Design an enzyme around this catalytic site. Structure first.
Site, PDB file in Angstrom:
ATOM      1  N   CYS A  51       0.834  -1.233   0.000  1.00  0.00           N
ATOM      2  CA  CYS A  51       0.000   0.000   0.000  1.00  0.00           C
ATOM      3  C   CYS A  51       0.862   1.274   0.000  1.00  0.00           C
ATOM      4  O   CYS A  51       0.354   2.322  -0.445  1.00  0.00           O
ATOM      5  CB  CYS A  51      -0.942  -0.018   1.197  1.00  0.00           C
ATOM      6  SG  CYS A  51      -1.855  -1.579   1.337  1.00  0.00           S
ATOM      7  N   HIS A  66      -3.947   8.020   5.339  1.00  0.00           N
ATOM      8  CA  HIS A  66      -4.029   6.716   4.633  1.00  0.00           C
ATOM      9  C   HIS A  66      -5.509   6.368   4.428  1.00  0.00           C
ATOM     10  O   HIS A  66      -5.873   6.043   3.287  1.00  0.00           O
ATOM     11  CB  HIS A  66      -3.250   5.642   5.396  1.00  0.00           C
ATOM     12  CG  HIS A  66      -3.022   4.400   4.606  1.00  0.00           C
ATOM     13  ND1 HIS A  66      -2.420   4.417   3.365  1.00  0.00           N
ATOM     14  CD2 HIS A  66      -3.303   3.108   4.878  1.00  0.00           C
ATOM     15  CE1 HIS A  66      -2.347   3.186   2.900  1.00  0.00           C
ATOM     16  NE2 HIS A  66      -2.877   2.361   3.812  1.00  0.00           N
ATOM     17  N   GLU A 123      -3.855   5.008  12.838  1.00  0.00           N
ATOM     18  CA  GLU A 123      -3.378   6.264  12.203  1.00  0.00           C
ATOM     19  C   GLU A 123      -3.684   7.451  13.118  1.00  0.00           C
ATOM     20  O   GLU A 123      -2.800   8.314  13.297  1.00  0.00           O
ATOM     21  CB  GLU A 123      -4.025   6.483  10.842  1.00  0.00           C
ATOM     22  CG  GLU A 123      -3.415   7.662  10.113  1.00  0.00           C
ATOM     23  CD  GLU A 123      -3.688   7.677   8.625  1.00  0.00           C
ATOM     24  OE1 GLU A 123      -4.609   6.945   8.179  1.00  0.00           O
ATOM     25  OE2 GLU A 123      -2.975   8.417   7.916  1.00  0.00           O
ATOM     26  N   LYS A 167      -9.375   8.046   0.052  1.00  0.00           N
ATOM     27  CA  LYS A 167      -9.867   6.662  -0.188  1.00  0.00           C
ATOM     28  C   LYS A 167     -11.383   6.601   0.021  1.00  0.00           C
ATOM     29  O   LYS A 167     -11.995   5.630  -0.450  1.00  0.00           O
ATOM     30  CB  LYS A 167      -9.172   5.646   0.719  1.00  0.00           C
ATOM     31  CG  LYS A 167      -7.816   5.169   0.218  1.00  0.00           C
ATOM     32  CD  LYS A 167      -7.124   4.255   1.194  1.00  0.00           C
ATOM     33  CE  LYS A 167      -5.699   3.915   0.805  1.00  0.00           C
ATOM     34  NZ  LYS A 167      -4.744   5.026   1.047  1.00  0.00           N
ATOM     35  N   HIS A 206      -9.129   2.272  -2.428  1.00  0.00           N
ATOM     36  CA  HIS A 206      -7.726   1.819  -2.259  1.00  0.00           C
ATOM     37  C   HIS A 206      -7.202   1.305  -3.603  1.00  0.00           C
ATOM     38  O   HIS A 206      -7.814   0.367  -4.141  1.00  0.00           O
ATOM     39  CB  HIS A 206      -7.664   0.753  -1.162  1.00  0.00           C
ATOM     40  CG  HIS A 206      -6.329   0.615  -0.511  1.00  0.00           C
ATOM     41  ND1 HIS A 206      -5.175   1.106  -1.086  1.00  0.00           N
ATOM     42  CD2 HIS A 206      -5.957   0.012   0.640  1.00  0.00           C
ATOM     43  CE1 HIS A 206      -4.148   0.817  -0.312  1.00  0.00           C
ATOM     44  NE2 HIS A 206      -4.603   0.147   0.759  1.00  0.00           N
ATOM     45  N   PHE A 264       1.053  -3.193   3.984  1.00  0.00           N
ATOM     46  CA  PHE A 264       1.072  -4.571   4.530  1.00  0.00           C
ATOM     47  C   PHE A 264       2.539  -4.975   4.670  1.00  0.00           C
ATOM     48  O   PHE A 264       3.290  -4.838   3.690  1.00  0.00           O
ATOM     49  CB  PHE A 264       0.289  -5.542   3.645  1.00  0.00           C
ATOM     50  CG  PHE A 264      -1.179  -5.223   3.532  1.00  0.00           C
ATOM     51  CD1 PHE A 264      -2.026  -5.376   4.618  1.00  0.00           C
ATOM     52  CD2 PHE A 264      -1.710  -4.746   2.344  1.00  0.00           C
ATOM     53  CE1 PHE A 264      -3.374  -5.065   4.513  1.00  0.00           C
ATOM     54  CE2 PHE A 264      -3.058  -4.443   2.240  1.00  0.00           C
ATOM     55  CZ  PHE A 264      -3.888  -4.603   3.325  1.00  0.00           C
TER      56      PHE A 264
HETATM   57  O1  LIG Z   1      -3.501  -5.684  -5.732  1.00  0.00           O
HETATM   58  S1  LIG Z   1      -3.928  -6.271  -6.965  1.00  0.00           S
HETATM   59  O2  LIG Z   1      -4.188  -7.678  -7.000  1.00  0.00           O
HETATM   60  C1  LIG Z   1      -5.432  -5.444  -7.480  1.00  0.00           C
HETATM   61  C2  LIG Z   1      -5.525  -3.994  -7.060  1.00  0.00           C
HETATM   62  C3  LIG Z   1      -6.900  -3.502  -7.447  1.00  0.00           C
HETATM   63  C4  LIG Z   1      -7.032  -2.041  -7.345  1.00  0.00           C
HETATM   64  F1  LIG Z   1      -6.951  -1.647  -6.080  1.00  0.00           F
HETATM   65  F2  LIG Z   1      -8.200  -1.620  -7.809  1.00  0.00           F
HETATM   66  F3  LIG Z   1      -6.113  -1.357  -8.013  1.00  0.00           F
HETATM   67  N1  LIG Z   1      -2.780  -5.973  -8.046  1.00  0.00           N
HETATM   68  C5  LIG Z   1      -2.829  -6.497  -9.364  1.00  0.00           C
HETATM   69  C6  LIG Z   1      -1.678  -6.461 -10.145  1.00  0.00           C
HETATM   70  C7  LIG Z   1      -1.675  -6.956 -11.414  1.00  0.00           C
HETATM   71  C8  LIG Z   1      -2.845  -7.520 -11.972  1.00  0.00           C
HETATM   72  C9  LIG Z   1      -2.929  -8.044 -13.286  1.00  0.00           C
HETATM   73  N2  LIG Z   1      -4.030  -8.567 -13.808  1.00  0.00           N
HETATM   74  C10 LIG Z   1      -5.131  -8.602 -13.038  1.00  0.00           C
HETATM   75  C11 LIG Z   1      -5.183  -8.129 -11.762  1.00  0.00           C
HETATM   76  C12 LIG Z   1      -4.019  -7.566 -11.191  1.00  0.00           C
HETATM   77  C13 LIG Z   1      -3.989  -7.045  -9.880  1.00  0.00           C
HETATM   78 NA    NA Z   2      -2.530   9.568   2.235  1.00  0.00          NA
END
Ligand SMILES: O=S(=O)(CCCC(F)(F)F)Nc1ccc2cnccc2c1
Ligand code: NA
Ligand SMILES: O=S(=O)(CCCC(F)(F)F)Nc1ccc2cnccc2c1
Ligand code: NA
Lengths: 415, 415
Positions: A170, A310, A321, A339, A344, A403
């Site tokens: 994060c 955050h 926080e 957020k 997030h 995390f």
């Molecule tokens: O933390 S993650 O799992 C999803 C974050 C979602 C969001 F918060 F909305 F941004 N990161 C990724 C990374 C690469 C990926 C490639 N292809 C499909 C999904 C993916 C998700």
């Molecule tokens: Na912030």
């Protein structure tokens, strides 16, 4: 007599351009105006995978404008998603900056991400099982490696003074900006493109994160599920996002007539050594992270007008926080939890929230924290809510907590 | 004036302990003796997956002592391979440094890696496809996230002055050491645990890198396959590894009676912005990574006695490195390519080769580059071959050059 921005020990670093793609809008200035109007990016997910798997979470914010709607056949074949997002934001950022001609030898790229080209690992795995080792693309590795995004942006713009990818979940986005700042103040570069990118919302991500039980399941009312510092919060909401900012020494930005948006004065990185996914309840190290950014800035807590919290909207996270903001002595600052409206974005969020901290200082406004309707009796901060608050914000701290108990705090100042 | 280690601008940082698990041995000191005796950890692969897929590459260096033989049933279910490696080496390093009591608020962890908890991605992907989102583990995210190895080590050892994870492919390990050094000279810590860790040899890893044409296929003489700077070189060999060192201010070392093995004097980070997997043929930015390392150390190239080259045995890689050392004016120096013996650890490798660079300065001895038989005219270097080379080595650079055009040089000094 330790070196600080205030006392001339570090060179003056300014933010001369920003770009972000968002659940509200692909244009950061539109996203900004939308946040000030109290808009939310968080909707009901209409993706078939939701109803295919009957997931606990049916809400989130997809980008208003899909990255891949701008990507031709070639780019779909030779890049992972975070790479394709990075190429897009990279080009937008440079054009916004006046396509400057910089010394590539004094030009760095530091772009964090949460995970990397993970989907290409899955795809390579499936192709190999169906048809053997030669069905794996010779491109598989350059797209899978988590330094892919930063390397694609560095190659795109010709950054030769270092291409870097900090990973701290994060806080990755905030950490990238910290490290770009270091790379400049230590004399390794005079200009740096920095920020974060992250993958889209999908079944496996939700499965993984919702099984942690850190996600809001307020599926009835999407726009009101993200409730940072509110008594009824039940965890965070996914909000797709990506953000880069251009930073350079004030001398540099002047030499080319670039009008600064703000100052990046200092940067603090600490850690909890408490839990792999839960923040230390006392906020002590998280606060030190903030205190440290102020030491390097040459600021004292009384100087901080604003804090870009955050604001995960988890129960323990917001309590933690609260204690941090008190421990750093920044509890009289106007707080904002973006957020609440944007959700997030993991590896991207720290850099988007730095882009909002910059604009806050530029325009002298903090947008309202959505869904702050029953303030938690155990948390006593000045959360901005209801309408945008016009104020004389000279200095702000942007917080990010990853995390792994990673704590990053960025010290920003008005130009 | 500019701050240099020589002119007292940066505090003197020292290496006070080291640890590595290699294909030669789990005991670093045993590995170092085997290397000087001319041994090779590269054997023919006995693994089933070789036969199942009939991989072109049938040679590689597994760990002499598998990580999981030291791991309980609960650790195997609760951690990713790289975390399990990180925990094991973290404990060994701490013990080797005499289990010192340090101020957790001045103690940082910087451990890089190549991929992360990747096996947990495919496993989660497979379980969810089998029995739905409920089947994904609540620990999935902490195991997958690439900062997971750094986190676990930080939590195990109670590092609270920051836990960080640079990913720059093959240079990740060296970059981890460069950031720990920065963390100390900028004043954010007094003691860091730094290095890198990496997953094991497996079918998809070999398919992925095989298909780039990056790897040696000299299956019939496994111990001769890895031929850095040799005319008859034909790509790199996988050699499993993990490596950590303990660095700290000389002051902090002195005060706890720790005996320094070497000094860490300087660290340069540059980028090719040339190509995603091909190094720039000119070696200019690579060499400028070396040059930068010497500026910060306060050394001139003339002062450099030893270089611990990347030496991946790729036709284009070694060519470019040779030009890089020419640009850095260090091409007078006794050169070693440890990959000749220990193979390519990717994320770990820079950490490993950094540890070997320490032991070289400590003992005044460079091991032989195995399989160096036919000098390449394109490589006009003093490559140590045949017998160890003995001498009064005072200053040594350890090079790493990762896929994506990431160049890390580390200036080390005799204590
Ligand atoms: O933390 S993650 O799992 C999803 C974050 C979602 C969001 F918060 F909305 F941004 N990161 C990724 C990374 C690469 C990926 C490639 N292809 C499909 C999904 C993916 C998700
Ligand atoms: Na912030
Ligand atoms: O670069 S990698 O693909 C192979 C490592 C190379 C070397 F160490 F040198 F042998 N990295 C990883 C990472 C995690 C893995 C978890 N399980 C299986 C294999 C893994 C390989
Ligand atoms: Na090396």
């Amino acid at each position: 007599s330790q070196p600080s921005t205030a006392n001339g020990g570090f060179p003056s670093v300014v933010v001369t351009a920003v770009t972000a793609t968002t659940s509200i809008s692909p244009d950061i200035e539109s996203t900004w105006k939308g946040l000030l109007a109290g808009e939310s990016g968080i909707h009901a997910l209409e993706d078939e995978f939701v109803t295919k798997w009957d997931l606990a979470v049916k809400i989130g914010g997809h980008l208003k404008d899909p990255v891949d709607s701008h990507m031709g056949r070639l780019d779909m074949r030779r890049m992972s998603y975070v790479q394709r997002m990075g190429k897009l934001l990279g080009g937008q950022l440079w054009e916004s900056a006046g396509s400057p001609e910089v010394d590539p030898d004094r030009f760095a790229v530091v772009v964090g991400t949460g995970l990397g080209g993970a989907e290409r690992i899955v795809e390579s795995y499936d192709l190999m099982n169906a048809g053997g080792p030669r069905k794996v693309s010779p491109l598989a590795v350059q797209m899978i490696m988590p330094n892919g995004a930063a390397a694609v942006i560095g190659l795109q713009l010709g950054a030769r003074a270092g291409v870097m990818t900090p990973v701290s979940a994060c806080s990755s986005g905030s950490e990238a900006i910290a490290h770009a700042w270091r790379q400049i103040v230590m004399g390794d570069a005079d200009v740096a493109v920095c920020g974060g990118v992250e993958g889209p919302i999908e079944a496996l991500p939700i499965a993984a994160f919702s099984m942690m039980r850190a996600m809001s399941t307020r599926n009835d009312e999407p726009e009101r599920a993200s409730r940072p510092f509110d008594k009824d919060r039940d965890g965070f909401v996914f909000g797709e996002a990506g953000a880069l900012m251009l930073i350079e020494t004030e001398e540099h930005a002047k030499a080319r007539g670039a009008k600064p948006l703000a100052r990046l004065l200092g940067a603090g990185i600490t850690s909890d050594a408490f839990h792999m996914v839960a923040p230390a309840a006392d906020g002590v190290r998280a606060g030190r992270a903030m205190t440290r950014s102020l030491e390097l800035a040459g600021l004292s807590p009384a100087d901080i007008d604003h804090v870009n919290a955050h604001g995960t909207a988890t129960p323990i996270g917001d309590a933690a926080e609260a204690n941090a903001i008190r421990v750093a002595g920044c509890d009289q600052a106007a707080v904002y939890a973006p957020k609440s409206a944007l959700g997030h974005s993991i590896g991207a969020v720290g850099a988007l929230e730095s882009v909002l901290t910059v604009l806050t200082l530029r325009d002298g406004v903090i947008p309202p924290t959505l869904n702050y309707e029953t303030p938690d009796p155990e948390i006593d901060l000045d959360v901005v809510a209801g309408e945008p608050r016009y104020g004389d914000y000279r200095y702000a701290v942007n917080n990010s907590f990853g995390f792994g108990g990673h704590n990053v705090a960025l010290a920003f100042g008005r130009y």
